Design a protein around this motif. Sequence first.
Motif, PDB file in Angstrom:
ATOM      1  N   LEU A  16      37.103  36.109  44.743  1.00 54.93           N
ATOM      2  CA  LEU A  16      36.434  36.655  43.568  1.00 54.93           C
ATOM      3  C   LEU A  16      36.636  35.724  42.346  1.00 54.93           C
ATOM      4  CD1 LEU A  16      34.712  38.908  42.231  1.00 54.93           C
ATOM      5  CD2 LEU A  16      36.806  40.229  41.948  1.00 54.93           C
ATOM      6  N   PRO A  31      33.048  43.388  43.242  1.00 50.62           N
ATOM      7  CA  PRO A  31      33.284  44.774  43.671  1.00 50.62           C
ATOM      8  C   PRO A  31      32.361  45.755  42.981  1.00 50.62           C
ATOM      9  CG  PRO A  31      35.347  43.782  42.980  1.00 50.62           C
ATOM     10  CD  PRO A  31      34.272  42.736  42.752  1.00 50.62           C
ATOM     11  N   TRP A  39      31.387  44.877  47.927  1.00 47.08           N
ATOM     12  CA  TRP A  39      30.823  44.172  46.788  1.00 47.08           C
ATOM     13  C   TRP A  39      29.302  44.271  46.779  1.00 47.08           C
ATOM     14  CZ3 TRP A  39      32.906  38.563  46.009  1.00 47.08           C
ATOM     15  CH2 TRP A  39      34.315  38.567  45.922  1.00 47.08           C
TER      16      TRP A  39
END
Length: 153
Positions: A16, A31, A39
Amino acid sequence: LGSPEFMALKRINKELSDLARDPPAQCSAGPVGDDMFHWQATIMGPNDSPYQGGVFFLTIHFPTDYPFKPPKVAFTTRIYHPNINSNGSICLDILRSQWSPALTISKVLLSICSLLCDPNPDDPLVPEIARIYKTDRDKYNRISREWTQKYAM
């Protein structure tokens, strides 16, 4: 004792950050609803594709044993494409039998973007669309553009 999802969670958090800091052109992902394993991604239709102007959303589910199994990735925006079916499934080898734990969500998104600009008609999920891409490219372009207008605006 740690949670069994500890190594996956640690890995997804790193991915991420990396994605946030340097995303593949015209993509974003992260997310939804604070679930680190679920996600959504957005791809803006590439300038060289008949998808230009469009916003395309995808769902990504990471398995508990990530990165040792691939993420599940599906479009939820309708798209006209030889390698993406009406269920939103994507024909990418690395999402099937060719996943490696060295690969990342950034690499998956980059590969999908590449597919939109350059379909693989020799590997068809929708043979009719592949046949049209190969034999009547102007028709493929205008149907792709029409659906982008109808579904991705």
